[PDB]
Amino acid sequence: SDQEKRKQISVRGLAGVENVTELKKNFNRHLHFTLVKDRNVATPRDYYFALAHTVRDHLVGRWIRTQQHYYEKDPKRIYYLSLEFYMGRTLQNTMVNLALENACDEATYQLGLDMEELEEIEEDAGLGNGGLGRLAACFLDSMATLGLAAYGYGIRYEFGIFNQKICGGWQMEEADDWLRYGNPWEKARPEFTLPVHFYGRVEHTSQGAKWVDTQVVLAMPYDTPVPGYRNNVVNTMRLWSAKAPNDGYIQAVLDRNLAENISRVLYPNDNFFEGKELRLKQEYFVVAATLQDIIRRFKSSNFDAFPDKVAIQLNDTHPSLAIPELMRVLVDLERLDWDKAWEVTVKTCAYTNHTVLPEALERWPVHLLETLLPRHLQIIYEINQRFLNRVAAAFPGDVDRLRRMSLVEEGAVKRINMAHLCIAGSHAVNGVARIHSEILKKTIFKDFYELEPHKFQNKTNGITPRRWLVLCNPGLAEIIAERIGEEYISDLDQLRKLLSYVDDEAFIRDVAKVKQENKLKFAAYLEREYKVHINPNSLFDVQVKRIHEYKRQLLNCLHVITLYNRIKKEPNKFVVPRTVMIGGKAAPGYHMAKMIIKLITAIGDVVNHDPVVGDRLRVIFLENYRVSLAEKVIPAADLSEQISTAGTEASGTGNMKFMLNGALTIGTMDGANVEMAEEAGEENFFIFGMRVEDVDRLDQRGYNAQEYYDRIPELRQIIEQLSSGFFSPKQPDLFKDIVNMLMHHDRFKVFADYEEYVKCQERVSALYKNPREWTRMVIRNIATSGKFSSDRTIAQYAREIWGVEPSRQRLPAPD
Amino acid sequence: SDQEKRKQISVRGLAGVENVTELKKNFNRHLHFTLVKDRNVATPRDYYFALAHTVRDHLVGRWIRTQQHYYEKDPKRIYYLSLEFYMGRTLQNTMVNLALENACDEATYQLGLDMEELEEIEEDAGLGNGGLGRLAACFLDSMATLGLAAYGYGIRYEFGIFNQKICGGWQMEEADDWLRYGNPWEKARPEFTLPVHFYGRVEHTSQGAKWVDTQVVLAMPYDTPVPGYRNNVVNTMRLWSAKAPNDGYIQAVLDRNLAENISRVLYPNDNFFEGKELRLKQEYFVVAATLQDIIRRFKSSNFDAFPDKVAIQLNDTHPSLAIPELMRVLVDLERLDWDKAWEVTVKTCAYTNHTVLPEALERWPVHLLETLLPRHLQIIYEINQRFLNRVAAAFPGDVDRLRRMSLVEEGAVKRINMAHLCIAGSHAVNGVARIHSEILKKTIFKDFYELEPHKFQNKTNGITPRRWLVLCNPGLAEIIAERIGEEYISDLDQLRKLLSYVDDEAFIRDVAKVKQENKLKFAAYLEREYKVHINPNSLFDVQVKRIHEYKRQLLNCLHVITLYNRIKKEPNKFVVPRTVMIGGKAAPGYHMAKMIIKLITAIGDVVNHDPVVGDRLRVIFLENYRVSLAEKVIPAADLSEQISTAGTEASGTGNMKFMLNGALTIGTMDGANVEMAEEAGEENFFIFGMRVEDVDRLDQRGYNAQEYYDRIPELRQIIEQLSSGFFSPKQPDLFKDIVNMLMHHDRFKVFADYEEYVKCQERVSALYKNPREWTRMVIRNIATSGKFSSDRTIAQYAREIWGVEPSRQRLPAPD
Ligand SMILES: O=C(N[C@@H](Cc1ccc(F)cc1)C(=O)N1CCC(O)CC1)c1cc2cc(Cl)ccc2[nH]1
Ligand SMILES: O=C(N[C@@H](Cc1ccc(F)cc1)C(=O)N1CCC(O)CC1)c1cc2cc(Cl)ccc2[nH]1
Ligand SMILES: *Cc1c(COP(=O)(O)O)cnc(C)c1O
Ligand SMILES: *Cc1c(COP(=O)(O)O)cnc(C)c1O
Ligand SMILES: OC[C@H]1O[C@H](O)[C@H](O)[C@@H](O)[C@@H]1O
Ligand SMILES: OC[C@H]1O[C@H](O)[C@H](O)[C@@H](O)[C@@H]1O
């Protein structure tokens, strides 16, 4: 067989040029050949798929080319391990990064179809809970845009974050069957399935330890392409799916599902640790399969050069088993000596911390680890012993420090502190905001910082400007481009140039206009899909994020109730109208969080139907908050609420989204809020409340909520209203749990920041009364948000942690 | 929006002409765009998929057109309900019916690929157990070829018939993960999902009965196209998949699998009834979803015309719940009166019986029916009461007949006789071979025949000549075409013309040559994938079918052991060399059937390694017998074994496959064997053993195997060898169960036909010694097999049962 004949098999002239004529042809081809529909039975969903497939074709030509390029060039490869990847919709984002948006628009118009209507049909890819998952998605976009040889590795959950329904004011969870109609963006690779072992036992042979009598679960990869911004670079996100091996009969076949349950559903916990066996299996699963893939890719073009060609970033402690698993492979399978293996491991792994809340920290009981992963538990003990020996050498006689630094936590239930394991086996450990990274060195990891100061870094979070500006706010992106060009899209610092238009009356008018249109649009979307009338001329007060006590949605609730009581007291007095919007999902077993949602809706029940309040105050709970809803509500927001208790929000990222889209911020000196105020100037920020140091003082002396209740009349009245059943007539004591918590067991001191919060809210209302000055402060914000682009964050990881150089060099097009 | 613009959305000029240039282009497009592979990483499996997708495109253009045609013309529609559809591979069959085989061959050659190698990569679609399932597949092909508006409705099992492995001579079952790499021939239709109810209870309202508090399981359809032979007609096979509805949290999501288990696996029972709940659910599932689809299609272009536009064929009693379900819908939902509903039902349904073995008959316990389908059990009782009233009117005072005809079978465990239910609610009941249909009227359904003689018919089975001749035996099809043309392919009766070449020396040489090549090929396939050396010059004695006592593979075993003992007795005597091949799967819990397989391999262990036997005798057990293996071994067979006990094989179809491909038959006067001998002339058939009437005599007086053991020395010796451990040295009494069964509990009288069988086998050996006369008898067989084409069978169903006229009119091509 002449092998020169197989040279015809090329992607050289396939998709055709990116003009309207070829696009319509392919749209048609896909509608008929791919979907087996005709113009008579086709529905809008079918038309949406035909378009997705048409765009996908252009995406694939570049995908194949990018991977060929990396094979030829062999760059250092970056592996981002995360159990979450909150991707959202992919159609629009693909059209924009490939510059096909226009042609697709024209091509769909000539066919008698409306592209915007089609885009709304796409299901959100919700394989994440919130901030942690979305950050991974932003980073993927940025790494592609910066031309890095990066791969995202995670789990392909069959069911992502649940869909939230509100019944009688309460949250109801519904499985998110996001694959029901299929996913055109993923490419299954059954041919690359790998084995993952569980349970079993350890045997010691003359030449080493052997992990035997193990149960096997296969890991099947699904690849999703991730396009960079107009540089023709398409990277890969590989998600693993669990499959049972082929080795009563009927029962035996039905029991296969048991093994496939590993990748069935995403744990809906945000910043909270649940030590369930299934979760541990998910963690080892993603890790074991990923590392095998990494080693084989490494051997296909000894291990001394491993750290030079491989960088493994651990997103939180979820994939922390990668450290002992890498040791297991190198020592048990590759037979390297312990010390060389360890050196390679530390040089390859880096760890990112995302929270300081103690209940969010993973501490796995050893009895669970010894039955499920016996060999890893042995390796962990060894790692521990050698690490503790170093400690003892650096701090002789300090037996207390040894106890505190141990990877093994004593107590009735022995547990492994995964955070300690990550610090010990990583060459770098980073926080996600300046204040958070400092807190890590000053508090929780102080002992580790003293032993190895060089390991601790900071990498302030960011968001991608493509999805969080160009995509969700085309109007804003339009008027900004009409003055400074399109170069900011991949270089956000250029937004700085906008400071020269702070005084231009044309610009001021435009910014205010884009926002009004965004608000008009959002108000329409609300009446259409959730029938209710909000006044588009009111101030849009928005707080959207996962429901959590530390995020203090309750502090927000206290404010709106204060506003209501005020109006009722002096009904004929003028107040700046407000539409307070709060949305977010609560973890299913988080009782307090679910009670907070009920409180929010109970408040709206009273406020929204009080005739004397009128159109002056509306409280709305946005149900099913997700990436696609964030893209709608954020560009329409005037005020962004970032009011977590100082020292609790590691960074936050939603705050940055609001800053980039023309909303002013009211928040505490927490996480990235500190750096945002720093960039825009504290005078262009609505800061309030305790600083981290004040919180420490209060803690030292003791928090007594009663003091505030006794000293603040307005607060007393609110609490009295809550306990009396004012907001729950048929059930007088429905909120007894919330009240009791605020009064006697509030770890986040809501009452302590109440007074400052309200006063601050008053200044917000004062400034909104003056349109031109409000819009001018907004411009001072948008103009200095450049530092919060994920491209900046990634550039820093690359250079300071991974040892690779970014690049905006575009690759050639398929043809 | 101008709706005239949407006229551009057409299949009018898509696939391009069927020439080599366009095919290569599409092959390439699919390899890259569809599979995301390039010529560097692509494997033969990838190349196979690129080709399948290329061929699929041509198949889809016609599919859309055919369905448009039926919409416009609105023919009477035929619905074939079956729980099995043994389809086998689809690539080659599609290329042949579309006449693309050649272009595909040339196009793949110019790309440096070999098409035959690619075809072998396709997985068999094994959604059937054997004869019953394969008949449904043959019928689908025939109905399409005869231009009937027919739809096959079944279940999309995730795992079909298990893969058979032989370990130490024993059968081992391995799940058949046939969807692992995907199925390019199916088109999922999530948009057409329908609800199916289970359990619940019946409430009586003033206006009727209501089935309430039911558990719901969704039914998602997957469509597979079925192309007719070169007539551009593409029909549909719709298979249902079970999906849970979207309404601890983690556990709740994991428990969804419970509902999806309904379509997880095919029960591997052939001609045997297992009353398990899961199986009953599968039966109602396919029925409830199918009938809903049928009603909606009916209303989209009152019920008095239902029987004029709808025909529902029940393949065995598996889908028998269609009768009470149709009544439930018409009476409970559509609110028709009982009598009108009943008339419509009987006029719409027809039932086909496939076996008389009592243990194969479905008799569901009422306690299972009342808890799972309470409303259907009520309807069944009502049907029963009104049917029994008719009986009482026609045969006054005959209380015994009333007991025998009842749909409800008394006893400790009350049961519903589904066969009786089908006869009562169908306008037609048919057997599958002349002798079988007569047995139905004479024995098991005698009471029903006496009440309604007009209901009973016969429809002798057939096989499709496309797959069973053109596809598997191109050489034979070639030489046949070179003398009489290609018109026989869709008109098998024309094979008759071949009787004029019985004396032509050229033809005789050719037929013998095609067979030798087929044998040479099969011998090569055996050494390559199952390393073992058979002599291609020996007589190929083949018996392939499911292992069953009534099929008497044991009678075959007795013969080969006799042959072995004979050789050993007179080693230097000449015998016609033979390669005895036996293959087939045994149901997992069928102990005796699994013991028979072990016996067969034990026999080969001794015979195949006896140096004095040499190349004169080889016993081979063909593992994992399936549709694709049948296509290989059948064309290479010389002698076809169809030796079931007279009166037990309803028809058989494998017998017809062997007849069409040049093998002579040695069998009993059973099932279709009777009609085959009738067509070829009994002198061209090797018939032997008891006739049905002889079996009855023996039964009347009593079967005593000892008599034969006492009177036949050769038989004694065999039994003595078996009990002594001659064939099982390390385990002397391993076959004690088989021996005991043959001696004291043989329901199929193996010993009674032993003597006649051996004598007959001797005549087979005598004729093979004379090549020219052997080949001339073969020609007399091939030439009269025309009557056994499924096109003939379907034509008869259409005209005599469905009321529709066949047609070979070709539809226009897509363009
Ligand atoms: O899914 C894709 N192609 C099909 C091509 C296809 C379709 C049916 C089939 F049977 C085999 C292959 C496929 O490989 N899978 C379909 C689902 C199946 O279970 C596994 C394979 C796909 C191509 C592609 C290109 C890009 Cl750029 C992005 C996502 C993509 N997905
Ligand atoms: O499978 C086909 N097309 C894809 C086209 C496609 C691919 C990916 C996707 F997300 C949506 C649609 C599809 O509709 N399914 C893929 C698997 C998914 O789970 C359900 C839909 C298909 C077209 C076709 C035409 C013919 Cl003639 C025969 C079989 C066929 N199958
Ligand atoms: C950005 C984002 C988050 C993170 O928001 P924070 O306010 O930082 O907690 C959570 N959910 C969604 C859907 C997001 O888009
Ligand atoms: C034709 C066929 C059958 C039916 O064979 P019989 O000898 O009639 O029992 C069974 N299995 C397969 C794979 C077939 O092709
Ligand atoms: O690091 C991304 C996100 O991780 C977690 O969600 C933290 O709670 C949040 O502060 C941070 O912004
Ligand atoms: O009807 C098709 C087939 O059904 C069953 O398998 C019967 O056992 C067989 O005799 C018949 O040929």
Overall 3D geometry of chain A?
A: globular
Which CATH top level class of the largest domain in chain A fits? Alpha Beta
Structure classification of chain A = alpha/beta
CATH superfamily of the largest domain in chain A: Glycogen Phosphorylase B
Share in helix of chain A: 40-55%
CA radius of gyration of chain A:
27 Å
Largest sheet data of chain A: 10 strands, mixed
Q: Briefly note the CATH topology name of the largest domain in chain A.
A: Rossmann fold
PDB class: transferase
Keywords: type 2 diabetes, glycogen phosphorylase, inhibitor, new allosteric site, Transferase
Assembly: dimeric
Entry title: Crystal structure of rabbit muscle glycogen phosphorylase a in complex with a potential hypoglycaemic drug at 2.0 A resolution
Protein model, in words:
The structure is a homodimer of 815-residue chains. Chain A has 815 residues and is of the alpha/beta class. Chain A has two domains: 6-462 and 790-812, Rossmann fold (3-Layer(aba) Sandwich), CATH 3.40.50.2000; 463-789, Glycogen Phosphorylase B (Rossmann fold, 3-Layer(aba) Sandwich). Chain A contains 33 helices and 25 strands. In chain A, the strands form six sheets. In chain A, strands 1, 4, 7, 8, 11, 12, 13, 14, 18 and 19 form a ten-stranded mixed β-sheet that branches. In chain A, helix 26 links the parallel strand 24 and strand 25. In chain A, helix 1 crosses helix 2 and helix 11 packs antiparallel against helix 12. Chain A is globular and about 85 Å long. In chain A, 50% of the residues are buried. The interface between A and B is large, with 73 and 73 residues. The site of one alpha-D-glucopyranose has 15 residues of chain A, from helix 6. One alpha-D-glucopyranose binds next to helix 6 of chain A.
